[PDB]
Every structure is written in C-alpha cells, then in structure tokens.
Amino acid sequence: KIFSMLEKFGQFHWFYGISIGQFLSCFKRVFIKTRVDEILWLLYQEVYCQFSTALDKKFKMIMAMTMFCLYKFDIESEQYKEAVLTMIGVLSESSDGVPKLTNDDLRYLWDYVTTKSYISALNWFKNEFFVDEWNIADVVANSENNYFTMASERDVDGTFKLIELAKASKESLKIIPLGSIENLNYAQEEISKSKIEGGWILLQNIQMSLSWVKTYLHKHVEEHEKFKMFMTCHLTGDKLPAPLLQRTDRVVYEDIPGILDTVKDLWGSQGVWSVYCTFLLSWFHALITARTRLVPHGFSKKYYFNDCDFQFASVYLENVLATNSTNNIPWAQVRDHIATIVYGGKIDEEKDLEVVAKLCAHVFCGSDNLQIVPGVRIPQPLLQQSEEEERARLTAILSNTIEPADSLSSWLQLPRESILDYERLQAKEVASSTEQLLQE
Amino acid sequence: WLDLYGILGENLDIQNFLPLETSKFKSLTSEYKMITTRAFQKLTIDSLKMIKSSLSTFLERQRRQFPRFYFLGNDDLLKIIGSGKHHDQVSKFMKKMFGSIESIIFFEDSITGVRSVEGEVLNLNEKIELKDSIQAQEWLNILDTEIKLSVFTQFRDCLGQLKDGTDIEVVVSKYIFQAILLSAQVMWTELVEKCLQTNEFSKYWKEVDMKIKGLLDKLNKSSDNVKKKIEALLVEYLHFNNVIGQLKNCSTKEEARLLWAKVQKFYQKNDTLDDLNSVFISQSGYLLQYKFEYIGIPERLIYTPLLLVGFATLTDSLHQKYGGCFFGPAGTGKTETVKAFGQNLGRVVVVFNCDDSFDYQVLSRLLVGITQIGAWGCFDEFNRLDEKVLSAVSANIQQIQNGLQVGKSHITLLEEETPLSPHTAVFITLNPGYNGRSELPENLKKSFREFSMKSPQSGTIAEMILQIMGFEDSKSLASKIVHFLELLSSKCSSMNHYHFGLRTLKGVLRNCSPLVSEFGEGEKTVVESLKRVILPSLGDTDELVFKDELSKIFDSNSKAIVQCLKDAGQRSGFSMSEEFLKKCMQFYYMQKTQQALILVGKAGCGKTATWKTVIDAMAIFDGHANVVYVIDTKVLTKESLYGSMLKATLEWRDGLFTSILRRVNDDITGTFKNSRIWVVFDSDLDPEYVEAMNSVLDDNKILTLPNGERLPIPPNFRILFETDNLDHTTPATITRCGLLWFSTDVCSISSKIDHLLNKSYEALELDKLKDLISDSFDMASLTNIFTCSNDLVHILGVRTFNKLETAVQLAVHLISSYRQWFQNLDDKSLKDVITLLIKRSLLYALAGDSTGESQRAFIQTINTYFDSQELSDYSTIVILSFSSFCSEIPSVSLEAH
Ligand SMILES: Nc1ncnc2c1ncn2[C@@H]1O[C@H](COP(=O)(O)OP(=O)(O)OP(=O)(O)O)[C@@H](O)[C@H]1O
Ligand SMILES: Nc1ncnc2c1ncn2[C@@H]1O[C@H](COP(=O)(O)OP(=O)(O)O)[C@@H](O)[C@H]1O
Numbered sequence A: 001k002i003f004s005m006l007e008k009f010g011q012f013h014w015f016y017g018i019s020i021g022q023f024l025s026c027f028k029r030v031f032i033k034t035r036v037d038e039i040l041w042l043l044y045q046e047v048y049c050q051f052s053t054a055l056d057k058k059f060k061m062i063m064a065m066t067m068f069c070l071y072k073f074d075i076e077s078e079q080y081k082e083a084v085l086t087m088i089g090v091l092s093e094s095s096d097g098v099p100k101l102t103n104d105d106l107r108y109l110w111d112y113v114t115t116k117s118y119i120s121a122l123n124w125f126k127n128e129f130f131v132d133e134w135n136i137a138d139v140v141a142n143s144e145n146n147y148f149t150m151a152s153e154r155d156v157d158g159t160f161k162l163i164e165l166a167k168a169s170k171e172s173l174k175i176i177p178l179g180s181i182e183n184l185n186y187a188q189e190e191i192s193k194s195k196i197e198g199g200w201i202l203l204q205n206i207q208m209s210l211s212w213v214k215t216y217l218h219k220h221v222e223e224h225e226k227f228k229m230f231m232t233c234h235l236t237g238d239k240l241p242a243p244l245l246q247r248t249d250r251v252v253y254e255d256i257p258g259i260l261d262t263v264k265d266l267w268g269s270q271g272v273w274s275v276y277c278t279f280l281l282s283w284f285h286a287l288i289t290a291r292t293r294l295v296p297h298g299f300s301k302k303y304y305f306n307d308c309d310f311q312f313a314s315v316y317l318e319n320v321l322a323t324n325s326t327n328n329i330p331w332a333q334v335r336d337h338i339a340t341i342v343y344g345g346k347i348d349e350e351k352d353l354e355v356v357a358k359l360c361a362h363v364f365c366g367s368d369n370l371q372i373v374p375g376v377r378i379p380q381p382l383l384q385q386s387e388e389e390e391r392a393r394l395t396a397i398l399s400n401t402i403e404p405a406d407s408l409s410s411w412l413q414l415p416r417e418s419i420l421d422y423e424r425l426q427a428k429e430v431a432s433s434t435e436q437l438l439q440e
Numbered sequence B: 001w002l003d004l005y006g007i008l009g010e011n012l013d014i015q016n017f018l019p020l021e022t023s024k025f026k027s028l029t030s031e032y033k034m035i036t037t038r039a040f041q042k043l044t045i046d047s048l049k050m051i052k053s054s055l056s057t058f059l060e061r062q063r064r065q066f067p068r069f070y071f072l073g074n075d076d077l078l079k080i081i082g083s084g085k086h087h088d089q090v091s092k093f094m095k096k097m098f099g100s101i102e103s104i105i106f107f108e109d110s111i112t113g114v115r116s117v118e119g120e121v122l123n124l125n126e127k128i129e130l131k132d133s134i135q136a137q138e139w140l141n142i143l144d145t146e147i148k149l150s151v152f153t154q155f156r157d158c159l160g161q162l163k164d165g166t167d168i169e170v171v172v173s174k175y176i177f178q179a180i181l182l183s184a185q186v187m188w189t190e191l192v193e194k195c196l197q198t199n200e201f202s203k204y205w206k207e208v209d210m211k212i213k214g215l216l217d218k219l220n221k222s223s224d225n226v227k228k229k230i231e232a233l234l235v236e237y238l239h240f241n242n243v244i245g246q247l248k249n250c251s252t253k254e255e256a257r258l259l260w261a262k263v264q265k266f267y268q269k270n271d272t273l274d275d276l277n278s279v280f281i282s283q284s285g286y287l288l289q290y291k292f293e294y295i296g297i298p299e300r301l302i303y304t305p306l307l308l309v310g311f312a313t314l315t316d317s318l319h320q321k322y323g324g325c326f327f328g329p330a331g332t333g334k335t336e337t338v339k340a341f342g343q344n345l346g347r348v349v350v351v352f353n354c355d356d357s358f359d360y361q362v363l364s365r366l367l368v369g370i371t372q373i374g375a376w377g378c379f380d381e382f383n384r385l386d387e388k389v390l391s392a393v394s395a396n397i398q399q400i401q402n403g404l405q406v407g408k409s410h411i412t413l414l415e416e417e418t419p420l421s422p423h424t425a426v427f428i429t430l431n432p433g434y435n436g437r438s439e440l441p442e443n444l445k446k447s448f449r450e451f452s453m454k455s456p457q458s459g460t461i462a463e464m465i466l467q468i469m470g471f472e473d474s475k476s477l478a479s480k481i482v483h484f485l486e487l488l489s490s491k492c493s494s495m496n497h498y499h500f501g502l503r504t505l506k507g508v509l510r511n512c513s514p515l516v517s518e519f520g521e522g523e524k525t526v527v528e529s530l531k532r533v534i535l536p537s538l539g540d541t542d543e544l545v546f547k548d549e550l551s552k553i554f555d556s557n558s559k560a561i562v563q564c565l566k567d568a569g570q571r572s573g574f575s576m577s578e579e580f581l582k583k584c585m586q587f588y589y590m591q592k593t594q595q596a597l598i599l600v601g602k603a604g605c606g607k608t609a610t611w612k613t614v615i616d617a618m619a620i621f622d623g624h625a626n627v628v629y630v631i632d633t634k635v636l637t638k639e640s641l642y643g644s645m646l647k648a649t650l651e652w653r654d655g656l657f658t659s660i661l662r663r664v665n666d667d668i669t670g671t672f673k674n675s676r677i678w679v680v681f682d683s684d685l686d687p688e689y690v691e692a693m694n695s696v697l698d699d700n701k702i703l704t705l706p707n708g709e710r711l712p713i714p715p716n717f718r719i720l721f722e723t724d725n726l727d728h729t730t731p732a733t734i735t736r737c738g739l740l741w742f743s744t745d746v747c748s749i750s751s752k753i754d755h756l757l758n759k760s761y762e763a764l765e766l767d768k769l770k771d772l773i774s775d776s777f778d779m780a781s782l783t784n785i786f787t788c789s790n791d792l793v794h795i796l797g798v799r800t801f802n803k804l805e806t807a808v809q810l811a812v813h814l815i816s817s818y819r820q821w822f823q824n825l826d827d828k829s830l831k832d833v834i835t836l837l838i839k840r841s842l843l844y845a846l847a848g849d850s851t852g853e854s855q856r857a858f859i860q861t862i863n864t865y866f867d868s869q870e871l872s873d874y875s876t877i878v879i880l881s882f883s884s885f886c887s888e889i890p891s892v893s894l895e896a897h
C-alpha cells in the first residue's frame, strides 16, 4: 500500500518517482536500527524519514497525513475512521460534519480546526505520529549510496547547505557548474580523479546539459569511501531520466516554513553587542521570510530573501559595531541601511519598501525592552556580561518561546481574513489531494 | 608584411622563441622582397593568413605581458607591436585601452603628456625619453604609472592651493578636472565635518551659494574646455549645496549624522607614505580606495537620491568583493550610475554589451582580460546571455570573487594561470521581464547584490540641468516639464511605443541646449525642444492631445532647409505636400540632436523617400559628401551581421556592420573625416538583432565585440531604422532612438502617378506622347475608379495605394512597345489606342488579383467610369487593330505520343 502511494506520487511529478531497491534498502534499515506491530511502526517512521526529503512542503503534508491515516485506520476502530474522514472532509470543503465523541488527540484536532487554524491542523499529524525528521546532513550521513541529487524550485539554491555540510565533515567540495563542453570535460576529468583518489564533487544545474546527463551520467552511475557526487536540478525544469534519478538519493530543498524553527536554524548556523545584533538579525530574517510567502497581502509580489542578504547584513552590523565603539550605536543608520540597502535592494515596489521599513523600525528600535513578538521580550545586554554568557542567555530565552497556532497573523501583525483565506486554500488543496489519493 | 617585420623581422632577441616561425617569416621575407623587386622593375595573402594562425600563442603571451592589450584585436596588436620606432600607431589605440585618452603628446622623441577625449590636456610629471630599441609594453607600463603619479601631483598641489584659502574660480583654470573635483570633495567633507562638530550650518551654506553663483557667472565668459569644467564642478557644487541644505533642515543631531553617513565622503589619510593609496572614499561606513586613474571631463550625472542609494549599495557589494546588480525597466540610469560610481572612485568603468554570441570561452576571456588589468567591468544587458552560458560562467565569477576576497595572487581560468589584480570588480545591469531574454540562475544571482531602480527622479535632473544652462526660472520650468510628461503619458492612447520616461527628457534637454542662440534661454526654447522631440513620434488624435496640453500647462526661419528639400525633391521628381514637408522637417530637426532614428509607418507609406530626399537636402545645405550603407537586418544572420568566432583556431571574423564600422574608424584615405555615414536597417527590429547594439545606441557609442574589440561610434556616424511595425520591438531600443511615426501616407494619388510617370520617362516626339498620357490620366475619373476598386475582394491583400506602380509601369511599357506604329495614324486613333492600353493596364493592375467575375465587374466599371475606345474582356491589339481572343486560338492536333 505504501509503495502504491509512492508510485502515485511519482505519477504526479517526475522527480517523485520511486524504485524497489530504495524501498527494500529502507526496509533493511528498519531492522538495522506486540512485535509485528512494532516492526510495522518502525517501518512507517523509517520510510517517512527516508522519503519525505524527496518531496516539497505540500507533498510532505500530504504524505504525512495519508501515512498517519493508513496507520490509524489499520489500528483504530470505525468510529475513528468516520471522525478522521469527516475532519479531512471539512478540511477539504467537501463534506461538513461534527465528529463523534469517544480519545484525546481527535479532540485536539477538533480544537485546532474549529479555531480556523489550518496549517497547524495539517502539521498536527506530523507532530503526533512521526517523531523524527531528516535534513540534508541526515540524508548524506545515513545513505549507503555515494551518488546524491538535489532539487529545488527556481530563485532558490541550496549550494551553501552542501558547502556547510562538507565543511562540518572536513571534506573538500568542488563545484563544477554545467552548461558548456569545457565544464563537461573538466567534470569528466575531475570525476575520474575523485573516484581514483577520493574527494567530493558537486555538479550545478544539470538540467542545462541534458544530452551529457542522459549519456555520460547514465553510463557512469549505472556502472572509494571519501567520494560523493552531488547534482542540483530545478523542479520546474525539463524532465530528467527515470533510472538515473532512481539510482541516486533525491532531496528537495526548500526554506523552513516555521518562524521559530528558522530562528533556531539561523542561530545554530552561527562582544555581547555582536551577539545581540546577530540574534536580532536572525529574528528579522525569519520574520521577513515568513511574511514573504504571503503573495497578495503580506507583500505585493514574490520576493526571495536568501542567506546572502543575512551575511551582508551581519557584516554591516559588525562593521558598525566595530567602528562605533563609543556605545552610541547608530540604530537609525542601521535601520535605514538594512531596510534600504541590504534587504531593500531586491524590492521593486514602494508599499513593500514601506512594510520592510516598518519591520526594521519594529525589530531595530534599540530600546531596553524590545517586544519583537507578542510573546517574547528581548532585553538589552548588560555592561558586565561575557560573550558566552550572552549567547547562553539568548539561547535560553529563544528555547522557552512557544510558537502560537496563529503565528502567521499575530507575529506578522496582519489582518486575519487574508491569512485565514491563504491557510484555508492551502489546507483545502492538501486535503483534497489526500482524499483523491486515499480512495484508490 | 610591415606588421610581421615589426614583430619579427626587425626586433632582436625575439626570434629565439619560435625557430620554425622565424624560418617561415624569413621565407615570407624573401617572397615579399622578390614581389617588391618584380613590382618595382593572392598566394601571398594566403601565406600571410596561414602564418597568422601560429601567432595566436605569441599574441596571448604579449597580452599577458601588458594586460590592457586584451581590449585590442589581433590586427591592432600587430600594429601596436610593430611600431618599434614610429610610436604614432600606439596613440590611435589609447581610446581602446584606456577609454578616456585619445592621443599622446610627443616632443623630440619623448613623451610629455596625454590628451583626454573631451579635449583636456594632462601634463606628465616627468618627461620620459623613448629609446629606439625599447618595446611597447615597457613604456606603456611606465606611462600608466606616470599618469597616476601626475594625477596625484595635480590633486595634491590643487588641494594645497585650496587649503591656502584661494577661491576655486582661479584654480579651475590651472589643473585637470579630476584634481579639482577630488580636492573640492575633500575640502567639502572636511568643512562639513567641522560644521557637524557644532550646530551651525548657515554660514557654510551661504558661502557655497555665493561660490555657486560666482561659478555660474564665470560660466558664460569662459572657453569651451573651461565651460565643460565649470559645468561639471557646478553639478558637483549643486550636490554640495543640496547636501548642506538637507543637513541644515535636520531637527536633531542623530538624523543629521545619519544623513551625513548615507552620502559619499572623500577622505585622505595623513600617515601613509604611499602616494597612490592616500585617498579613500567612505560611504555608510565602508571604505574604498581611489585609483587615481585619468578620467577627463565626463558628462557628470546629477546626484539624485536614487543615485546616492545606488552608490551606497554598490559600495556595500564591493566591500565583500561581490558584484553590482542593477535591475529595472529600461531608461532609468543603471549603466550611467555604474559609470558615475567608477568616476567618483577615479577609474574608467569598462562596459560590455552581452549577447547570445558570448559563449563560455568569450566571456571567460573577457573576465581574464579585466581581472589582469584591474579595471571595473560592467556587463550591460546580462539577461541577453544564454542560460547555459550564464550557469557555466558562475564558476569563473565565484572564483574571481573568492580570489579577490582571500587576496590570492593568481587564479586559474581557461586552463591557464593568470595574475589577479586586487582593483578589479564586476557589475551587471539587466532588464527583467522582457521578451527574448533568459533568466539568471540563483547560484549566479547569489554572487551579485541586487538593487531596483524602477522610479528615478526626473524633476531634480531637469531642474539641475536647466540651472546648468542658467535658466531664469528653473524650478517652475522643471515642474512644468515633468507634470506635462506625466499628463502626456496618462492622457494618451495606450500604444506600445509611447514611452515618456527619462531618455526623452534627456533628449529634450539636449535639444534645448543648442537653441539658446536662436530662441533664447526660456519658455520658447523648451516648448520648441519638446515639440521637436516628442511631436514626430505621436499619432493623430494624440497630436491634438499634445497640442492641447502644451497650450494648457505652458502659456506659449528655416527657409534655407525647406528650399533645399524642395530642390532635392525637384531633382528626384517628388512633390511637397503638407504631410511630406512636415515629415521632412520633423526628421531633420529630430536627427539634429539624436544620432539614432526609427522610421515607423505602413508599408509603402513614404519612409525611404523621406530620408533619401532629406539626405539630398543635407548634401545641398552643408556641402558634405554623403555615403549611405543600407543593410537588411533579418536577411543576414547574427553571425554574418556582427561577427563570428572560428572555433577551430580561436580567431575573430568581422560581420557586415562591424566591417563598415572598422573601415570608417580606420579612415585610410581621408574620405570619412568630412562626410556623413548612414547605416539603415531596412527590416524588422528583432530584439535579438538590435539589442546587441544597445551600447551603440545610447551615450556609450561603443560596440563591444566578443573578442574584446571596442569600436567607438564617430559623431558623424548615424543609424536609421526603417520598419513597418513595432509589435515585437522591445522598449529598450525604442527609448534609445528618436522615433518618427507615419500616421498617414505622405503622398497623394495624383502626385504618385506624376512621380512614377516622371521616373518612367527618366528611365527611357516624346513630349507629345507624355502630354497625351498625362491628359489621359484624368484625376476626376481615376479617384472614383480607385474608390470603387476597394469593393472587390482581392487575394493577397494589397492596398490600392501600392498598386499604382504596377499600373504606370505596365502602361508605359505598353506605349513604349507600340510606339513603333504610332507615326502613321491620326490623333483620335492614337488617343483611342493609348486609352485602351491604359484601361487594360489599370484592369490587370487593380483587379488582376481577383476572380473572373470580379474582373468582368471591374472592366464594366472602368468602361462606365471613363467616347473613348471600349475595353472588352478579350480585347487586344494586333499588328494596330483592335481584335478579340476568338481568332488567336491556333488549331492544335496532338499526336498520340
Ligand atoms: N512626396 C512623394 N511624391 C511622390 N511619390 C512619393 C512621395 N512620397 C512617397 N512616394 C512614393 O511612395 C512609394 C512608397 O514609398 P517609399 O519608397 O518611401 O516606401 P517605404 O516606406 O520604403 O516602404 P516599405 O516599408 O513597404 O518598404 C514610392 O514608390 C515613392 O515613389
Ligand atoms: N542623474 C541621472 N541618472 C540617470 N540617468 C541620467 C542622469 N542624467 C542623465 N541621464 C541620462 O539617462 C540615460 C540613462 O541610460 P541608462 O538607463 O543608464 O542605460 P541602460 O538602460 O543601459 O541602463 C543616459 O543616456 C544619461 O545620459
């Protein structure tokens, strides 16, 4: 049944195709890592962690919902069947009906959907059933395959993630973009050299050299221990060969949908004033990338705030803090430069410049008590603390925060109707897709 | 042979590299000596081309020795190396290497100084004696160093003079523009910091205002070179006054400090022992090093707020050695912003016009050319590159950025190790969301820092520039111009070519500049400039709208040129209608200040005749000989138009337009110096064919070839564009050219008949026949016949206006053919025969593309609408008696086989 699900997913999009070798290898890892139900449970979490990274966010929620479905529909009773199907239906705007009271998690889902919260209702199954998630680091570490491929939509790139991964692994990546015959020949020489003597290699934009990918890469993957191959392709690009993709591990890279999760990631990726400034910058970057997804109401268009803007803003913050050492930090200058030069360069309209100026005025007020979100207030550093103590205190005040269910409205200070429409449309699409998927 | 003898046949210790090439050169020397002796008392060119192939590595190493040779072609490199002792061949290519230098001052076989493009003269600190045995690269390198030292010397003693307390009005007559500019900026930032230490700003504001007024007074009575210098200093001082006035209006000190931080500041270190690195520029905290490269007196931009924010984001990008990315709609000032940033940083920004022909090898060669030099590279229209090439060169660009950031001495690109100068940088200007343009991959977009410049400030630009000419009321006039342009853009028909952005404002100002001597600097001049720029490009109802708004928002001889046009049409057989003469006047007045023109109208509406008779009028009026090159753009491919790279041996082959530009730049026989040269692109404006000339059309006036060749466009080199529609023509090339729309046809039916008849009798008593055929071409019947001819359904739909040519040519051919039997019959028979032939020609020219029933209806209506001889459907003239087709059928009895 799970294989039929994955085959339907591959029937949707070309990148989502699945072979039998990968599934059987995953089943082997189940045993490598009431008994038969325990192996079934471990199979569910192992297959989820293995093949969730090969799908984008909507298909991640689709797969999580239908897998939690299949498990619960197996285990629980028919009243649970009716309640879950009617809750998916009212989430899908197809069938409307209250659930029948019995355990507790169904009541939690009923609370989450009766408060008109949709994204959290979709993610409830992922947080409830599955208790593990995999990033690119977990995929690269826990794979017997030495060949990896990586996909993303246009106007986003995850080469920096692989560069960081190689740096933390004490390896030597070698980026060879494709598109010209000189780069193809250089990549052939380097792939032979790296197979002979070890070393990592990365091929960028493989969809722009489809003939070479169809011949040389096919005959190479078809046929050392410190050697890995990485390939980057565009999800909206031209179709790539099925056997070559089935012979390589597939990872889809996208920005983290959470706000607090984005803050935690940007904090873990990095005197006391420098620590405070980079904490504020991480919070601001997470807030603006969360607001960026809301096309018609959060902004006026679709923008893309990547880590390069974060790096440039952090460099500017350190340059300001080092030069202005008289403790009179030019907060207005920092606000103007971040809202105008660093994060405002890509902005084309004027209402978007106004809203990014409002955001920068909110997050860089330079006050002793700053309330960046309605739940968390970040005090300014004292005059007698150290860098390590400041970092520990900021991590502690970050960890105690709990993201609310309506964090796309209260934290972004937006009208509720637009957010409700966006969440309702997205959850309706996801629930309709899983309803069409679950009937066959 | 001269180039080969210069590189190998005369220089010593140069033949020890390649012995086989030395032997081949000796054999070619013997052959050339034998040929010269035979001439004094084909295969040589082939042998020269064959031995040219082996010279590629030699030229590559020569370019490695002097990195600025990468901007020269192989032939130019041969010319500059072969000039061992003449030394004048180098002086012609300084515009190709440096850009702002056009010649070298020579004195007694020694160098004295350089000469800028704008006519400025820079005197070197120490004259360098030139040896007979020296080579080009040594003295070129020491001249490159000496120019920077001379610029620093002029800046230093000019700054000392200004610090001593003298006024700038006496200093501007002594030093070059760059020294005055840099010293003035240093003095201004020092005084502004002194004022910011306190709360007082009014005294310095008043001092700056009096200095500006004094410069404006001195502007009128100064020489042309000094006029340009004072104009550029006045632009800078207007920026100074704007900044000081903005600082004076700050309520608190914090916002004053922030506003001072956001603007470019020009400091000078007072501890460094190295002279060339003593000046650093601070903006928003980041510091960049002045290069002290010679600039000349460029057209200084008006320092708008958008320009300052663009400068700030360029400095922010270059602090981490990243790339500068400017994106937005066309005609907003991206390339000019990059060039102005470079000029403020004391270097000439080298601009490249990207194309589809720029593959990986070409772009990588350009990158290694600019990184070895240390110059700043601008990749203008970065979207025009192929997506594959854009992804491929991402590795090279990232390698350059990493080498600059880590201070690596050498980088490896194109399978070779080359030094990387720390002064180099890369910029891109691109127009997103346009037809026929690729998209940058994100891994490449992460190596550039984006900035959007969709909305410029045209009001500040117009106000400052009109103040530069010294208009009495600058603020009100600028507001009126900008409001008028906005009303014209908002209250007109939504046509594709109706763009009223900033390039049209710049054209209006450039047209108002030379009319001060005829209309006076005021309202009349600006409305005349607005008319002469915008009116030719508007339609019919939009013309009335333009006139109405011009009368609303604004309160309010040419005999020789019109006489010249009338004479030109008289010798060409044309006729001056109101529309034709209006179009000729519009074309003349719009080309007077615009070097590139687009002629848009219906097919056969009068474009070619218009520009040909205007060309004849120019030849009569000015006395200049005129040569015209007509090129059909889409008949030829891009490779045959611009040029191709022979991938077998990596050598350059010229196209057609490039060939014309090269033979007008070379100027071998002195015939192109005092002539006008017109290139007419008489086909559709494909973006892929025309956008390769964006650097040609705009103020750059340069054609960036793939092989690094940078051919400048001479001021007498004008480009036309004759076309039918602008459906696929992108606005990027629309705004760069003065457009001339043809709302209606420029000629009448009767005048067209008369002109075609005159042409036909020019192509050939005759006076009696001409009078008879002119009398038979009665307009009263002809107009009604042509009006009735529109009812017929015609296959291969052609307007009846275009079918006059077929009718007149067929009729004249018929009379010419039957003239052999026209001297033995009376007048009435002659009239009947001629009118029968004319009716037959009109039938087969007007309804000849229609069915048989339509042809019968048309011969019926031409018989009713014309006494004369009737025309039947089978009527003919046999050897001269009218008959039918019934008796012309011969009896045919075919055999079986
Ligand atoms: N003022 C005039 N007097 C006489 N004939 C004229 C006049 N203006 C135009 N014509 C005639 O109009 C005809 C078409 O005009 P022209 O040669 O300028 O076409 P065009 O604009 O080049 O056309 P296309 O775009 O179809 O190539 C010509 O045969 C020319 O003789
Ligand atoms: N202060 C200014 N800012 C921008 N453009 C200006 C300014 N002053 C004059 N201009 C004129 O505006 C035109 C801008 O062209 P530009 O948009 O830079 O070309 P591109 O479309 O290749 O970027 C130039 O021809 C220049 O002469």
Ligand SMILES: [Mg+2]
Binding pocket: B335, B380, B381, B429, B694, B695
């Ligand atoms: Mg351009």
